[PDB]
Amino acid sequence: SKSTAEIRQAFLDFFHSKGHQVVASSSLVPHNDPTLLFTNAGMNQFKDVFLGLDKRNYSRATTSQRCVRAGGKHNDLENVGYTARHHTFFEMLGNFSFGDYFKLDAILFAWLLLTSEKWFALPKERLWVTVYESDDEAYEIWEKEVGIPRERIIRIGDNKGAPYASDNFWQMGDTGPCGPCTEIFYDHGDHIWGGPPGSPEEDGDRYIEIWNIVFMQFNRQADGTMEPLPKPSVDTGMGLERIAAVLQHVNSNYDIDLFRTLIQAVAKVTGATDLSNKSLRVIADHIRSCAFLIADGVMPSNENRGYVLRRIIRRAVRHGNMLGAKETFFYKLVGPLIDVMGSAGEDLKRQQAQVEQVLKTEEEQFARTLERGLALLDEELAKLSGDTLDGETAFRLYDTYGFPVDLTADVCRERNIKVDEAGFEAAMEEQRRRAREASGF
Numbered sequence: 380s381k382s383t384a385e386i387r388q389a390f391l392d393f394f395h396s397k398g399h400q401v402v403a404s405s406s407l408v409p410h411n412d413p414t415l416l417f418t419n420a421g422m423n424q425f426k427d428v429f430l431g432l433d434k435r436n437y438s439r440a441t442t443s444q445r446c447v448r449a450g451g452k453h454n455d456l457e458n459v460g461y462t463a464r465h466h467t468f469f470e471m472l473g474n475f476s477f478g479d480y481f482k483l484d485a486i487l488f489a490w491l492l493l494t495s496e497k498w499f500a501l502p503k504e505r506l507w508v509t510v511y512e513s514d515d516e517a518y519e520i521w522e523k524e525v526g527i528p529r530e531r532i533i534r535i536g537d538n539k540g541a542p543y544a545s546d547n548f549w550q551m552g553d554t555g556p557c558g559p560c561t562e563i564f565y566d567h568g569d570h571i572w573g574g575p576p577g578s579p580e581e582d583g584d585r586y587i588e589i590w591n592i593v594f595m596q597f598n599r600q601a602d603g604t605m606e607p608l609p610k611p612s613v614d615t616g617m618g619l620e621r622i623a624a625v626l627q628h629v630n631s632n633y634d635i636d637l638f639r640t641l642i643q644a645v646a647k648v649t650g651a652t653d654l655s656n657k658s659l660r661v662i663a664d665h666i667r668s669c670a671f672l673i674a675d676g677v678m679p680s681n682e683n684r685g686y687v688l689r690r691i692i693r694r695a696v697r698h699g700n701m702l703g704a705k706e707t708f709f710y711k712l713v714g715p716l717i718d719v720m721g722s723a724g725e726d727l728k729r730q731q732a733q734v735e736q737v738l739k740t741e742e743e744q745f746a747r748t749l750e751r752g753l754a755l756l757d758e759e760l761a762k763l764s765g766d767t768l769d770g771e772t773a774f775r776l777y778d779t780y781g782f783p784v785d786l787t788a789d790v791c792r793e794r795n796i797k798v799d800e801a802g803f804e805a806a807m808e809e810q811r812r813r814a815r816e817a818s819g820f
């Protein structure tokens with residue numbers, strides 16, 4: 380069928396033929412807003428255009444934005460390797476309307492691309508749509524204009540437990556452009572556990588959310604106030620990996636051509652013999668987030684963006700150890716990654732050597748203490764009464780061996796053991812004030 384690269388280009392070509400300006404992906408590092416750790420959506424670089432503070436020569440655009448959702452806000456790190464649909468690094472295919480077309484055309488564009496014989500040509504029967512409970516306009520558009528059976532049109536209100544807090548109300552953050560949205564789901568088959576959106580089993584991998592179409596209408600204020608945007612606008616986002624899985628007739632993102640080739644590369648450098656397991660998929664995902672973050676200027680450190688990068692690198696190195704890696708391996712995956720990304724991996728190839736050295740240095744540094752740290756964790760788990768590793772042990776693995784608390788928790792999770800992360804932060808704070816007491820500052 381179609382490769383991931385062909386699907387990415389087809390999406391861009393579709394909207395380009397619909398008068399959309401093709402705009403390059405922005406960096407993973409936000410422009411002078413932290414606050415946000417990482418670019419997590421395609422609309423980020425158009426934020427001020429939605430607010431009406433900035434205007435473009437074009438009124439409609441389309442992008443394939445690289446996103447990282449490993450802190451915040453959206454943090455999907457603990458889903459990586461457990462679900463069929465979650466990555467840290469992923470490309471969000473988006474079309475944008477800046478005071479141009481609104482709900483009807485946005486919905487028609489998406490449906491045409493998905494179901495048309497000229498385009499993706501997906502069977503209408505396997506597509507479910509959600510709307511915001513109060514969004515009657517979106518409901519009637521799906522029902523009367525598109526012709527979706529009412530059975531597969533699901534109203535969702537404030538299911539997160541506060542007003543405007545909803546799976547069908549997309550918000551950028553505590554402030555910024557937002558509005559009710561309509562989301563398109565794909566039924567992967569009854570052989571997979573899961574229910575439709577709204578069911579107690581909606582988290583299953585059967586009904587996977589493919590495309591989120593946001594009808595930008597409000598600028599959310601600090602005080603929780605919704606202030607109307609000057610011009611109603613559209614912000615859409617479709618996971619390239621998720622739509623690629625659908626189009627390549629597989630349930631999992633890790634079964635698409637890109638991740639198949641990438642997982643094969645991981646197995647080659649680690650010596651893994653399994654077709655697929657948690658570690659293989661985690662490392663394949665982690666190299667994408669680590670390599671692209673460094674290419675975008677993020678350097679490993681013990682604070683802020685750098686520490687998130689450091690956490691991901693070291694968790695990937697841990698999984699390499701699980702697979703039985705004998706030598707430094709992580710940096711050897713940059714080449715293979717560049718090859719599978721195509722045009723989306725050109726900002727990376729530009730600095731291959733630099734990214735490779737950073738990852739090599741980082742792994743070698745962590746390798747000093749990794750195995751001795753894993754041995755300590757194993758002897759502490761062997762004498763652990765209860766289901767929770769204490770904070771002192773987690774602090775020790777951090778202070779001496781450089782184990783991030785979530786890395787320690789990742790290992791313990793695989794054995795049904797929890798981590799007292801409150802006791803860890805307490806032990807962390809106690810060290811901070813010892814430094815304050817001793818230093819005087």
Ligand SMILES: Nc1ncnc2c1ncn2[C@@H]1O[C@H](COP(=O)(O)OP(=O)(O)CP(=O)(O)O)[C@@H](O)[C@H]1O
Pocket residue numbers: 448455464465466467469471588589590591616617618619620621
């Ligand atoms: N961690 C992740 N990995 C891969 N794709 C993701 C992702 N988070 C979001 N996407 C994709 O980006 C699109 C728009 O982003 P959005 O913020 O709506 O995600 P989401 O959080 O609603 C998906 P879910 O509800 O399954 O977590 C989604 O339709 C989804 O396909």
Ligand SMILES: [Mg+2]
Pocket residue numbers: 453
């Ligand atoms: Mg989510």
Ligand SMILES: [Mg+2]
Pocket residue numbers: 546547562588
């Ligand atoms: Mg959702």
Ligand SMILES: [Mg+2]
Pocket residue numbers: 546588
């Ligand atoms: Mg969702």
Ligand SMILES: [Mg+2]
Pocket residue numbers: 546562588591
């Ligand atoms: Mg969503």
